Symmetry: D2
Subunit: 158 residues, 4 copies
Amino acid sequence: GMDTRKLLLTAQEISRMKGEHKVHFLNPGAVRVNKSLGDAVGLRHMGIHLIQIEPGKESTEYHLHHYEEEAVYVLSGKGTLTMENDQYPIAPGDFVGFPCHAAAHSISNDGTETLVCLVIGQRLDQDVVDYPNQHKRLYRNNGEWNLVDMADIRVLRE
Amino acid sequence: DTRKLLLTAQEISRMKGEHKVHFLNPGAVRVNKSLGDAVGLRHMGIHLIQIEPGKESTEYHLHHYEEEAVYVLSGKGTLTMENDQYPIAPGDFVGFPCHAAAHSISNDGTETLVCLVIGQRLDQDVVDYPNQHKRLYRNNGEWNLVDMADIRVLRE
Amino acid sequence: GMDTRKLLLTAQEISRMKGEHKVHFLNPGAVRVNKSLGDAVGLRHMGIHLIQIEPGKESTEYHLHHYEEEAVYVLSGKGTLTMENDQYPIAPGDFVGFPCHAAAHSISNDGTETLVCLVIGQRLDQDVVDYPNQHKRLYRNNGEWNLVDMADIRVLREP
Amino acid sequence: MDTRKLLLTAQEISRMKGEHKVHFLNPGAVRVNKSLGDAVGLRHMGIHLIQIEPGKESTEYHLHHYEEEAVYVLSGKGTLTMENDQYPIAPGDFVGFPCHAAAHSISNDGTETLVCLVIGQRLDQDVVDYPNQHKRLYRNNGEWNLVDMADIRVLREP
Ligand SMILES: [Cl-]
Ligand SMILES: [Cl-]
Ligand SMILES: [Cl-]
């Protein structure tokens, strides 16, 4: 029926979407154009985003999720995946997945063309995200965001 | 050990993939590469699928609890969604909020249809198959398939 | 402050509550006065009920939950607890708990005074409940209640 | 299975060994705890028969964000403090706490032992406030993080 045409986004509908200019709240160098495919069609439990990262910019602030899984599939362009210590070049057709607690990561575009990726994530009401380079932990609980310096956390049990 | 979370394009080309046939539709045959299982994802499925000409992606279905989406990488297909057909092609995306639309995809083209299928993985779901008139209740490993004519709907 | 006083239900408030006359839809003998202490204060994820079962009546239709836990604490009087193929007498201060899939049960009051219990249970958006004596399975899924004769269920897989 | 294991007679309960419990933030919150739920295998609710002696408390004044809790008084008398008001409690009284409704604690200022059933949700994640200590506890699957409220940057609320 005509009332489910909206669930299909053709390639050219996607191309013409403006998307949002997004800067990560802890990294002014993490700047991207974000086209939320999931929000366009009404998905509420996962995020599916077509992102464009220009040369010299990053995908995020180096981070590790405790409850939300996340993944990235490269569509065009080339980048550098930083994962724990290590750096890995990435290219189109590459996939990276992050099970909970597995590995902190960020992606940079140190190339000469736009890096275009699908970013795929769970959307949960509660999560904990660490930002090791900032020494901060975010507790996110049903819309309440609580950012705490890791030095201020008394760990009673691990 | 962190290298295991990255699958290069070349590694993905070398993956054998699994031959999969949908339990309710013998024409729903694909070769599936579970990218999420290869890196250890447990709450989402992310699969790279190949559907040959004349075959389908699934049995026409509707989820009550798991969200699902499809992103076309190469080739061409026909999406059947709430009894309407739409041609699909590389770069097209279709997503399914729960209870929104029953669908299936067929490859009536000449070249392989390659897609990424992205879904939630939940311990409990209910899935309708309108052309079979069956509802599947899937509950932690127990699968119960019931003809819709045998379901008595109750009020709260 | 004053807006919190409603979270306390004193003994006299409780004894004065009329409660609801509740009859299980699968068992006309399962008739009880139900005082929902949890709904009175605003609990949403648990059910806490003070129930009265008169002599000759029962607590429920014999059933098994697959996802919601349930428990009973006897405050006064006596009853007969049926679990699977076994019957046990119960009396004041006794406690019975039902982990998921553990045992089908019902309680009868075959004594001479009212049987008064606290019934404590989870409230989940999804559950499956079996009524073995009626040959029925109930699938409850956020507001969609689906009752199916057990012979009409094709079991394709089990864990 | 052996169904007799799901039934605890009043006598069995009488006989059960109590666990001596002291709240981690309040040395005056001492009780003897009998976990009825654990004794029979319940995993998603806590049902405890507790004994609080004269001069002791049930807890450190607190508020749950995700787990519901309730108390039903079996014998003895106590004083319920809830949102800074005091109420006498006695046998047959019930008090319940929807999430975020009210901070409370119970004190036994009587002369007899205070005996109650404490009924609670058991969740993997919870947030708990202790207003008298100006601390927040983030409990996430076995990791316990205690943070002074002064050290929390609230970036967003609901
Ligand atoms: Cl297009
Ligand atoms: Cl830490
Ligand atoms: Cl019938």
